[PDB]
Amino acid sequence: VQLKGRDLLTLKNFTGEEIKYMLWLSADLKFRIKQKGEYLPLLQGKSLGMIFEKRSTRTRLSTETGFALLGGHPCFLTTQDIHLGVNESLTDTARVLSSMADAVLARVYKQSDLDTLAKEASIPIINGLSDLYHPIQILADYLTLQEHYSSLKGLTLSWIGDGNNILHSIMMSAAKFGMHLQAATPKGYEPDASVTKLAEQYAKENGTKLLLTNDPLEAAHGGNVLITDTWISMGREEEKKKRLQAFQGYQVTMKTAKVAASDWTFLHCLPRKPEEVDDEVFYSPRSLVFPEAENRKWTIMAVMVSLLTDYSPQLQKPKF
Amino acid sequence: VQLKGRDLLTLKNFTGEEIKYMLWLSADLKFRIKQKGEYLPLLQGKSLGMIFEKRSTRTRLSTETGFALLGGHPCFLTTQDIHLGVNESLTDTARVLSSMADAVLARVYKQSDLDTLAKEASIPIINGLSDLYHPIQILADYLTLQEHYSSLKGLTLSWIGDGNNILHSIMMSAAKFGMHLQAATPKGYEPDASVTKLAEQYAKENGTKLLLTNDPLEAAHGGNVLITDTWISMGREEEKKKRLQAFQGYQVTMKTAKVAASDWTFLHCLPRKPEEVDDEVFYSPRSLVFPEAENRKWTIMAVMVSLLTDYSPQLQKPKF
Amino acid sequence: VQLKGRDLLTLKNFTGEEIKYMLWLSADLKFRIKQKGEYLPLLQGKSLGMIFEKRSTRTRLSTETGFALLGGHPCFLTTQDIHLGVNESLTDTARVLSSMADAVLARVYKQSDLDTLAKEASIPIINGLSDLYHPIQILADYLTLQEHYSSLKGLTLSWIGDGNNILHSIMMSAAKFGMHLQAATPKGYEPDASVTKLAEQYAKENGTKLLLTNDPLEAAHGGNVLITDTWISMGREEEKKKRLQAFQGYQVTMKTAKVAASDWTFLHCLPRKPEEVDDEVFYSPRSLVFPEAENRKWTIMAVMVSLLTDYSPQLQKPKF
């Protein structure tokens, strides 16, 4: 595996082996720093441009404390403070960022903006969430699952919710780890047809199952991991009611868990609202939500180290 | 004294000996770094979450440059950038902060928010000012006074102004250093009845006097330190006039100082407006305002070091 | 040359020799860090207050990554977050910044605010752009030109655009390097009469030519460097049309270059709009725009090191 200098816009560009390497490095960095208490200045004398177009708590903190914990300087940049709209062409900000920072993490709306940024910048561009994908979230999720189950292959993931960026990222990666996917979305709220097609292909290549359905309980049946995220989230758009009406019945409850495998667990990328999951499941001993949120930090540290240095993990490779 | 792992929401939870330790450590860090020019990476490999709900110049700068000066990474977080209102439950942001940062300094409105944050987070929560208390301000104030007078015991503090967070913090701490307090507030603008009751108790336990009055000159009589803060500060609320009418006569002038002890000095937490104090007192050689503002930095550094490390002061304990 | 402790509000206060020293140090820091890959913690245990009243991409990034790359902590401060308007007197924020940071870079509107800040603060105040000057931009520009041409003396600079802060900074410095200046501005959009008078004086003292004109092609004739910046920039003020009407004919095109010296190159401080220069010149192999933007970083690093440390350049002095 050779990842230095690459961008990380989506997991579709990464093989099973490459994503497994990032989880190995995550585990290595976590063992060395969190458990052995070592100081590892691997990104010393480096900087990161962190462009944020939307609010963030987890991606913000994990990237900022993580970049800094390796001795590098993270630079928090917003639309309000820098030139980015009608203020300056993205080609120009991409070249300017290239000569001043060593990499960019950018949370945008348009995935097309990440593509322009990656084409125009000569430094690594990491996706901090876009409307289409959220790869660095799935990195934390899969690490949290490997830590819980001691392996990944053969697990069935049960998505219940909107056919959004988190589901597309799972779709781009689950089969590469030999994990099955059963996903429930309302009619008209399906995953992107292009992504589904590629997920079907990955499932065939890896001998895993892919199931798309509109029934929450069908998605949950025999699943080891129940996964959801905010659906209602129309923000605050008066006419909404329909993201409530179409999504009625998608709340993850213990009824949902009753249908799942005996060793079931629960994930949610956060922030969480009451509509997608109730308090009984969200704060269940089986809920891996806050371990998951913590692993956003060790995995973005591993992303940064693999895309910018030639560091080799000292840890034994985790069983996947 | 054992302070590692504790929160610092208010000085009422701290004994005279514990607050004296923080001022000793402040003095130690200041002597070592400001005077001997040493580099002390005591908070290396640590991060701080700095949640700010209101504007700040002194708390912002002192905490940020101070955390960084000890080799740690401070992370400036606002309501605008992270999920914090109706955006995410505070219990969840508190647990997320716990796995990503080593401590949190939070400037909030509600003291109840600091309490939730302290109960839910497994990392130290430091008060960056709330409506009810501002403990880290009084730390700087008392250090500035010890440096001026070479001791603290027996000094009489003269508050003139609103019965606010600064006065409550003095009330929670002055008697523990064996200092007397005389405080003037307008009728209806008295300190919190709960705080006053506990201040009366501390005065009795330490053999000091507590005097509450509505007369500025009564508060100032025989006082070694004249202390005030912005009262008018209705922000900009049209109907106000009353915080001007009720507070008319509360401006600290040389008339006020004429009634004070011969060795009188003046404090103001800042920012300062013309209404609470005139330019003659504010820029008097007896005004300790800018030394006080500087000591916000050495004292928040000592707070952070005592709540996160096992560092022992090398300096001789200051005379209190 | 002795620059430690000085402010840098404008290049008019600096001799040819002093500005040459900053470009030597810039080149030294760039060779050592960018080319030899050295880590130089020259600003370790120092902090910078970066006050920004307006948007910034280049000044923000270059100052922040550059201060940090030398081991110091940059602190990004805005009008929204700190007390600065009617919130606190500038004299007081200047003294508070003096006891908490080691230097201040401030992007303001009024040059008078930088003057108050420099008079009241006991720490170095660096101009991050004001309405009247932008000295640290011209530092990068001249370094980029020295790198391109291998010297500076005798080059003719051709300004076409508004009589703004960039032109005033060139006016304050070009002749001190023995470079001629030909500047075109519309009628009524001339450089400040006070600045022009001092530029005329510098030209006489150094034996260089100064030409002010309203004709773009007259400014461009025989010029080695074509320089422009955003003129239209009325922001978004409806009545504008006149900054378009008065400035019609000021777009730098290959017609402009045809009249220039054979070895011509192009500069633009950025951000760039389509009106001041077309895409053919802006993205020409002769366009030094993005090297120029990169040199904002090495030059602000040299400013900071010369105003705060006693570091001597190890590099051979560049030929100017």
Swiss-Prot record, chains A, B, C:
Impact noted for substituting residue 134 to R: In OTCD; late onset
Keyword Membrane: no
Consequence of substituting residue 106 to P: In OTCD; late onset
Result when mutating residue 154 to R: In OTCD; neonatal
Outcome, altering residue 21 to D: In OTCD; late onset
Catalysed reaction, written as an equation: carbamoyl phosphate + L-ornithine = L-citrulline + phosphate + H(+)
Subcellular location field: Mitochondrion matrix
Modified residues (N6-acetyllysine): 36, 54, 110, 187, 197, 204, 209, 258, 273
Active site: 269
Pfam family, one: OTCace
Signal peptide bounds: none
Keyword annotations of the record: Acetylation, Amino-acid biosynthesis, Arginine biosynthesis, Disease variant, Mitochondrion, Phosphoprotein, Transferase, Transit peptide, Urea cycle
Segments passing through the bilayer: none
Subunit structure: Homotrimer.
Known role: Catalyzes the second step of the urea cycle, the condensation of carbamoyl phosphate with L-ornithine to form L-citrulline. The urea cycle ensures the detoxification of ammonia by converting it to urea for excretion.
Disease: Ornithine carbamoyltransferase deficiency: An X-linked disorder of the urea cycle which causes a form of hyperammonemia. Mutations with no residual enzyme activity are always expressed in hemizygote males by a very severe neonatal hyperammonemic coma that generally proves to be fatal. Heterozygous females are either asymptomatic or express orotic aciduria spontaneously or after protein intake. The disorder is treatable with supplemental dietary arginine and low protein diet.
Protein name: Ornithine transcarbamylase, mitochondrial
